[PDB]
Amino acid sequence: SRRRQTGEPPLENGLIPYLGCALQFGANPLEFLRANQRKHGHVFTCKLMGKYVHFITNPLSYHKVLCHGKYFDWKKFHFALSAKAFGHRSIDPMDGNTTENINDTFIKTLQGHALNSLTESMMENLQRIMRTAAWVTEGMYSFCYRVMFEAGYLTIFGRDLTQKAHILNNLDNFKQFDKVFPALVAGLPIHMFRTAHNAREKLAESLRHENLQKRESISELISLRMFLNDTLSTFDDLEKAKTHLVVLWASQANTIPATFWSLFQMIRNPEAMKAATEEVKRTLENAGQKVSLEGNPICLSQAELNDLPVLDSIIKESLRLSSASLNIRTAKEDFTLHLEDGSYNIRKDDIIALYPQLMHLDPEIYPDPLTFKYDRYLDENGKTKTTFYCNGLKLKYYYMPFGSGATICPGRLFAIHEIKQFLILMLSYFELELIEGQAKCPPLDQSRAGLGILPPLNDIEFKYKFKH
Ligand code: HEM
Ligand SMILES: CC(C)CCC[C@@H](C)[C@H]1CC[C@H]2[C@@H]3CCC4=CC(=O)CC[C@]4(C)[C@H]3CC[C@]12C
Numbered sequence: 001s002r003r004r005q006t007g008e009p010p011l012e013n014g015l016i017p018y019l020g021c022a023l024q025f026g027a028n029p030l031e032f033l034r035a036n037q038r039k040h041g042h043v044f045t046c047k048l049m050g051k052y053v054h055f056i057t058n059p060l061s062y063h064k065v066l067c068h069g070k071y072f073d074w075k076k077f078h079f080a081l082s083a084k085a086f087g088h089r090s091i092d093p094m095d096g097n098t099t100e101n102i103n104d105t106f107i108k109t110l111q112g113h114a115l116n117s118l119t120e121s122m123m124e125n126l127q128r129i130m131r132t133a134a135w136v137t138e139g140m141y142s143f144c145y146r147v148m149f150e151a152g153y154l155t156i157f158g159r160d161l162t163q164k165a166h167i168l169n170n171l172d173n174f175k176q177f178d179k180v181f182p183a184l185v186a187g188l189p190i191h192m193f194r195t196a197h198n199a200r201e202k203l204a205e206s207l208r209h210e211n212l213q214k215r216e217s218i219s220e221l222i223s224l225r226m227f228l229n230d231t232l233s234t235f236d237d238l239e240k241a242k243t244h245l246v247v248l249w250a251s252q253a254n255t256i257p258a259t260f261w262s263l264f265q266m267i268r269n270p271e272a273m274k275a276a277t278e279e280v281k282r283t284l285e286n287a288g289q290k291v292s293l294e295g296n297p298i299c300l301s302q303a304e305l306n307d308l309p310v311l312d313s314i315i316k317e318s319l320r321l322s323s324a325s326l327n328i329r330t331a332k333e334d335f336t337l338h339l340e341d342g343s344y345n346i347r348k349d350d351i352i353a354l355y356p357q358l359m360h361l362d363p364e365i366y367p368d369p370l371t372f373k374y375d376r377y378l379d380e381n382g383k384t385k386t387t388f389y390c391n392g393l394k395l396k397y398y399y400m401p402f403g404s405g406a407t408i409c410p411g412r413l414f415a416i417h418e419i420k421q422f423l424i425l426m427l428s429y430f431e432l433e434l435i436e437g438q439a440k441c442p443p444l445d446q447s448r449a450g451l452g453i454l455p456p457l458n459d460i461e462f463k464y465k466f467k468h
Contacts, residue, residue, distance in 0.1 A: 020047030
């Protein structure tokens with residue numbers, strides 16, 4: 001076994017060989033870390049699934065970790081996770097299967113100019129899917145899944161302009177595969193889950209280059225990713241298809257619960273709904289956009305979308321409460337980490353992690369942290385508030401659902417645009433209400449801890465009726 005040495009943080013080895021604290025950590029991730037915070041302070045080491053994870057819990061120490069250091073490796077763990085879960089060979093250039101910098105691929109196609117067409121495509125696709133008036137009762141999460149999945153799929157992978165059952169099949173397959181994702185990350189083989197195994201292979205088949213080339217309006221991302229698969233990799237046809245499944249999962253898995261919580265919190269709070277309705281009404285008027293189901297589709301520019309402070313605040317506050325990401329980096333060699341709490345010795349191949357849900361729900365940073373306050377990221381005038389403090393010091397990192405530094409989601413700008421577009425269209429098309437307005441906020445499904453946004457454990461019913 002491993003023993004704590006000179007300078008090294010307090011070590012918690014756990015009661016199980018290999019797993020260590022994994023079981024206890026999985027049982028209640030936030031309370032497990034909070035209990036270790038009381039027992040060991042802001043810096044402690046946990047043996048998890050064969051690894052030794054140093055947790056940095058002081059929000060004032062996040063900057064020393066999120067920096068581009070010569071001792072950190074921020075790809076090796078992610079690349080391995082992807083390989084195991086999606087069933088492709090190593091995408092690490094050191095392994096010689098590809099020479100592609102996937103980070104460069106994502107930057108080039110999810111940001112800058114590429115973002116314009118991608119944003120424009122999402123708005124067209126959403127409107128295609130969403131367009132005597134009667135009240136339709138449905139599960140809010142079920143609704144958000146239908147709408148966001150189909151729109152997201154068509155925006156990223158283009159349209160087959162030749163078929164409704166096929167969209168429904170991909171939808172169902174994705175639900176079946178995504179259901180066992182926490183187990184796949186843990187190390188359990190997909191073979192063990194027959195339904196999910198078949199689902200993953202069916203998803204992969206439809207994303208083969210031969211099937212993708214037959215589609216209209218493919219994203220610059222996938223068309224670049226196809227080109228680089230052929231030019232810079234030695235992957236087989238199915239492996240190439242599985243690299244597109246990684247991108248499908250990445251574009252859907254966090255957007256769907258993110259969309260649910262934003263929609264839910266906006267309707268649940270009458271104050272948030274009234275403000276958002278007025279903002280969308282104001283924005284559409286100034287852009288000369290008329291909401292008509294039979295006429296021409298609405299068009300909003302990136303500039304118009306980025307100037308929605310109320311919606312931005314609603315999304316940010318929705319993510320603040322539901323984000324459960326695990327910010328990880330690995331030690332390249334043995335070194336000493338210098339933090340506000342002290343100096344700690346870290347060994348080679350050790351993991352240095354952040355669980356920013358500890359910060360998002362910190363009462364010292366966010367007063368009444370478990371309450372949804374729609375204007376939490378707004379000032380007196382109604383402009384985005386970027387100043388948050390912690391024990392007197394102004395915080396550089398205060399909101400991290402997409403991560404930060406080099407370990408940041410490249411799809412963040414698109415993610416916020418597509419949620420905004422869904423909310424704009426939902427407010428413009430329908431009259432919205434809940435089955436039980438005075439019903440409790442659903443508990444977060446903790447089985448998805450470390451994988452991004454936590455979905456609700458149980459779905460909430462809601463009603464919608466198109467406007468005249
Ligand atoms: C609410 C929406 C989303 C959330 C909260 C989210 C969150 C994240 C987080 C936390 C990571 C890992 C950050 C880290 O390295 O510690 C990540 C990675 C990534 N996300 Fe997002 N994401 C979202 C939407 C999207 C969308 C719409 C796309 C579209 C393509 C996307 C593409 C990716 C990709 C490709 C990576 C991996 C980057 C790399 O390893 O090189 N994400 N995202
Ligand atoms: C060309 C492809 C093979 C690119 C591969 C991208 C892989 C490495 C990326 C895409 C989406 C990323 C995940 C996004 C969601 C996420 C949230 C977290 O809080 C921890 C890290 C994870 C679990 C990420 C791990 C690495 C993933 C799976």
